[PDB]
Amino acid sequence: MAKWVCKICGYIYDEDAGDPDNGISPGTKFEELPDDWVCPICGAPKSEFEKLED
Ligand SMILES: [Fe+3]
Ligand SMILES: [O+]
Ligand SMILES: [O+]
Ligand SMILES: [O+]
Ligand SMILES: [O+]
């Protein structure tokens, strides 16, 4: 599945890994993240993430 990078701090949201400590199970697509989800490192909103793909 896809990876997305936080343009602020460099955290990688890996869809295969999810973010289970913050309520997101593995295999959760970025588009399916709640509107209130933020970067677990720096707190950046979803707007500041970019998908790693051409
Ligand atoms: Fe971040
Ligand atoms: O990706
Ligand atoms: O994970
Ligand atoms: O899941
Ligand atoms: O936002």
Swiss-Prot record:
Q: How is the cofactor bound?
A: Binds 1 Fe(3+) ion per subunit.
**Which GO molecular function annotations are given, in alphabetical order?**
electron transfer activity; iron ion binding
Give GO BP annotations, semicolon-separated: alkane catabolic process
Q: Name one Pfam family in it.
A: Rubredoxin
Q: Which residues bind Fe cation?
A: C6, C9, C39, C42
Q: Where is the Rubredoxin-like domain?
A: 2-52
Task: Alphabetically list the UniProt keywords.
Answer: Electron transport, Iron, Metal-binding, Transport
Source superkingdom = Archaea
Requisite cofactors: Fe(3+)
InterPro entries given in the database record: Rubredoxin, Rubredoxin-like_dom, Rubredoxin_dom, Rubredoxin_ET, Rubredoxin_Fe_BS
Q: How does activity depend on temperature?
A: Extremely thermostable, being unaffected after incubation for 24 hours at 95 degrees Celsius.
UniProt family annotation: Belongs to the rubredoxin family.
Q: Which PANTHER family match?
A: RUBREDOXIN, RUBREDOXIN-1-RELATED
> What the protein does?
Rubredoxin is a small nonheme, iron protein lacking acid-labile sulfide. Its single Fe, chelated to 4 Cys, functions as an electron acceptor and may also stabilize the conformation of the molecule.
Protein name as annotated? Rubredoxin
Give the gene name. Answer: rub
